[PDB]
Amino acid sequence: GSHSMRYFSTSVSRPGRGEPRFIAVGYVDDTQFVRFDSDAASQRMEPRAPWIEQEGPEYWDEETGKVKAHSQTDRENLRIALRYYNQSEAGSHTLQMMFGCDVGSDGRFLRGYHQYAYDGKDYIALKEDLRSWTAADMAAQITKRKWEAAHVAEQQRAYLEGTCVDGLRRYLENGKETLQRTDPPKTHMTHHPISDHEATLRCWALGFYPAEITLTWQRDGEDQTQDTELVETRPAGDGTFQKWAAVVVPSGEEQRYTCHVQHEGLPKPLTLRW
């Protein structure tokens, strides 16, 4: 059980029609636990997972503090952005940020992240060593100079290796029953004739957590990586996930194909046969 904590933030300017839209969410693994929305009436950081509600009014105040501050910083970042590339104040622009830390099973620091996108393209990110940034263009160069001059990294490195992961453990302990159990996929296969010369095998996986999953289709034991319709994994909307995989099969050959399923909630990987 490797684990991750992530925050995502999006700010979208509305030239003319108000301040930027700002939306922030947090995740332990594929479970969202908190959200901020500037448009919502509550104007606080809000819970989205039963267990984070254990936290005191202290935590709510301070988290609201920070997400609020960040949203203001975004407002200015959007303004600065236009200035850097000389863009119209009439266009709508999007500003995104990811932050988090990864721990292994023992609970110890693996990885830390802090990266940004402007208009959906990489802008600036903290390198893996956590001591320098990677800047995607000349605008982001300027941002980087400031950040080195300001010695921002020394703070981020420490925060990630220190407080981020400490926060990760504590959430994992608190939201135990939920975050630490792993739900396995209920699997099955369906058959859908489409002509007199061909039929469709579709392999399902349902009710699984976490979202990480591999569906693979074989013929005679030979991989079929090329001839396989695969859907992007998708949430049930009850905290589980779903995926499926499909192959067009020459009528009479259904028995030549097998379906393979890997998921860390399965002791053994599965072979499914029609």
């Binding site: 920070k66 200015e76 300001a150």
Partner: peptide, 8 residues
């Protein structure tokens, strides 16, 4: 715990 962050 949400991050502290800095101006571009």
């Amino acid at each position: 715990r949400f991050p502290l962050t800095f101006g571009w």
